[PDB]
A paper describes a structure:
Examples include herpesviruses and most bacteriophages, both of which replicate their DNA as head-to-tail concatemers containing multiple copies of the genome that must be cleaved to generate unit-length viral genomes. This is achieved using a “terminase” complex, which, in bacteriophages comprises two proteins, termed Large (TerL) and Small (TerS) terminases; but in herpesviruses contains three separate components—pUL15, pUL28 and pUL33—in hitherto unknown oligomeric forms. The terminase complex recognizes a specific sequence or structure on the concatemeric DNA and cuts it to produce the free end where packaging is initiated. Acting as the packaging motor, the terminase complex then hydrolyzes ATP molecules to translocate negatively charged DNA into a space-limited procapsid through a dodecameric portal. Each subunit of the hexameric ring is a heterotrimer formed by three proteins (pUL15, pUL28 and pUL33) interdigitating with each other.
After a unit length genome is translocated, the terminase utilizes its nuclease domain to initiate a second site-specific cleavage step, leading to the dissociation of the DNA concatemer from the filled capsid and the start of the DNA packaging into another procapsid. Recent evidence has demonstrated that the nuclease domain is dispensable for DNA binding, and that the ATPase domain is the primary site for DNA binding and is required for nuclease activity, suggesting a concerted mechanism for DNA cleavage. In our structures, the nuclease domain resembles closely the RNase H-like endonucleases with conserved catalytically active residues like D509, E581, D706 and D707. However, the nuclease domains are distal from the central channel (~45 Å from the exterior of the channel) and the catalytically active residues are oriented towards the sides of the channel in the hexameric ring, which suggests that head-full sensing relayed to the terminase complex through the portal would reorient the nuclease domain to be proximal to the central channel for DNA cleavage. The regulator linking the ATPase and nuclease domains might be involved in this re-arrangement of the nuclease domain. Notably, the two regulator domains, one from pUL15 and the other from pUL28, are positioned on the two sides of the ATPase and nuclease domains, as if to act as hinges to regulate conformational changes of the nuclease. We suggest that, upon receiving the “head-full” signal either from the portal or ATPase domain (possibly recognizing specific DNA sequences), the nuclease undergoes conformational changes around these two distinct hinges to switch modes from translocation to cleavage.
Numbering used by the authors: 476 to 693, 703 to 728
């Protein structure tokens, strides 16, 4: 009973443009992912959310509820074609617009996969722009979120979701029923059908939030929602993420 329907008419309604108003953006680009490694489950998709900043508010570029296909031996790489296949589409319609992006991968499933997952992300990102697109000779310049496991001093490029979920939700609903965030007119999708609305598909899933401690997800398929909210909590300030 959380996100107001007055905001939902607004957040569904207004379609601002980042093709023209790009110069009024922060040149950085947070992006989150939520890998779920099982298949054939209505909440086991993998979320994509990529967000930028205006002066004080936040703005959405692409959402992919990435299911797992059947018969997967190369499954982390497929997730890597998802998220990089998104970032290339954002950077594509935004020529010379962004300085550097920051990919976030959660490791609540395991710390083991996300290392080679983000490594395989930097692999294909490091592949693509040198092939074609434009002459951005290391233009959009990737960095990652490098975290520390509890009890291990070695920094790996991942993100724990331990203490952060409640201030992230409180930040998101702090902004969202105030009409802070918005979704771009040129919001990008690959997995969701170009016929159907992406923003409608988000807003259905946004409508399953819960109380002051927020034990959420009544339901199914929170991954887009949880993805957007961790993405926007990193769209504000926190500890520094860095280069790989």
């Amino acid at each position: 009973p959380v996100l107001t329907k007055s905001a939902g008419e607004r957040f569904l309604l207004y379609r601002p443009s980042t093709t023209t108003n790009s110069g009024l953006m922060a040149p950085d680009l947070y992006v989150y992912v939520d890998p779920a490694f099982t298949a054939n489950t209505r909440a086991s998709g993998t979320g994509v959310a990529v967000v930028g900043r205006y002066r004080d508010d936040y703005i959405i570029f692409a959402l992919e509820h990435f299911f797992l296909r059947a018969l997967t031996g190369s499954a982390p790489a497929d997730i890597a074609r998802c998220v990089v296949h998104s970032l290339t589409q954002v950077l594509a319609l935004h020529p010379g617009a962004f300085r550097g992006v920051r990919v976030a991968v959660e490791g609540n499933s395991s710390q083991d996969s996300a290392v080679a997952i983000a490594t395989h992300v930097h692999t294909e990102m490091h592949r693509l722009l040198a092939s074609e697109g434009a002459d951005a000779g290391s233009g959009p310049e990737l960095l990652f979120y490098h975290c520390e496991p509890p009890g291990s001093a070695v920094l790996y490029p991942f993100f724990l979701l331990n203490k952060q979920k409640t201030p992230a939700f409180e930040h998101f609903i702090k902004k969202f029923n105030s009409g802070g965030v918005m979704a771009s007119q040129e919001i990008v999708s690959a997995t969701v059908r170009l016929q159907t609305d992406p923003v409608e598909y988000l807003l259905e899933q946004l409508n399953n939030l819960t109380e002051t401690v927020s034990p959420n997800t009544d339901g199914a398929s929170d991954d887009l929602m949880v993805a957007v909210i961790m993405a926007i909590y990193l769209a504000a300030q926190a500890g520094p993420p860095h280069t790989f």
